[PDB]
Design a binder for this molecule. Structure first.
Ligand SMILES: *C(=O)[C@@H](CC)[C@@H](CNS(=O)(=O)c1ccc([N+](=O)[O-])cc1)C(=O)O
Ligand SMILES: [Ca+2]
Length: 240
């Protein structure tokens, strides 16, 4: 997250870190959202490489013991059947991960609340992106979880020629674009939490940013619209 602030320890308990095995250690590669005690929602692009993955819940500082983490392997990966790595702009950037064990819920580990199907936010709706992604374009990951206020940018504006044009679809949410605050590499897969009727709900799965850089004016961070895939999500969870 570029232009973020350090999140308080118990503010976003559904945020997870998805990590891959690297030698005798583990490396963060993407965020995700815990949606069932044994299921996490993340981006399909985060699992395009055939790596060994784990999920960490209750995480705050990636480089030190917080005394609140739980570590669990990924037993099954279900990517949206229409996902294509050659066309992230086509959409369908969503995947569900069945965990090998069910995690224990507590004040640091909670399920993410999803929006009702079909819900679309009005332009300029209040949302926060969270994650341990790069803190600058071509920078390095954050040690501590970061948050940034990124107001939505509706579809008509987001798909206009000076913003993202035809690259953005109505199956995505855009947020940000001020040239200061944004998601960045390593935030992919995580949540976009937006306040609606007094409750934060996860409306987006972080998907992409401009090839020009993370925080680029009129290139808001783009997210898979969670409310377009509620049936798919429930269908997977139920048939697995
Ligand atoms: C996500 O982090 C976005 C920017 C918000 C970037 C792409 N994702 S990534 O850099 O985390 C990533 C993770 C995993 C794979 N893979 O397994 O192939 C690829 C990329 C971005 O849009 O540049
Ligand atoms: Ca830690």
């Amino acid at each position: 997250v570029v232009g973020g602030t350090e999140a308080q320890r118990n503010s976003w308990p559904s945020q997870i870190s998805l990590q891959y095995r690297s030698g005798s250690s583990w490396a963060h590669t993407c965020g995700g959202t815990l949606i069932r005690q044994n299921w996490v929602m993340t981006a399909a692009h985060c699992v395009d490489r055939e790596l060994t993955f784990r999920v960490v819940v209750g995480e705050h500082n990636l480089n030190q013991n917080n005394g609140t983490e739980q570590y669990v392997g990924v037993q099954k990966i279900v990517v949206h059947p229409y996902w294509n790595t050659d066309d992230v702009a086509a959409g369908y950037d969503i995947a569900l991960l069945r965990l090998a064990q069910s995690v224990t819920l507590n004040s640091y580990v909670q399920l993410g609340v999803l929006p009702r199907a079909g819900t679309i936010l009005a332009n300029n709706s209040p949302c926060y992106i969270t994650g341990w992604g790069l803190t600058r374009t071509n920078g390095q990951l954050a040690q501590t979880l970061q948050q940034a206020y990124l107001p939505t940018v509706d579809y008509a504006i987001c798909s206009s020629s000076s913003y993202w044009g035809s690259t953005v679809k109505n199956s995505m949410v855009c947020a940000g674009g001020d040239g200061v605050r944004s998601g960045c590499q390593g935030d992919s897969g995580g949540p976009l939490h937006c306040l609606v009727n007094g409750q934060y709900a996860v409306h987006g799965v972080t998907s992409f940013v401009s090839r020009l850089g993370c925080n680029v004016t009129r290139k808001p961070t783009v997210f898979t619209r969670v409310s377009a895939y509620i049936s798919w999500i429930n269908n997977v969870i139920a048939s697995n």
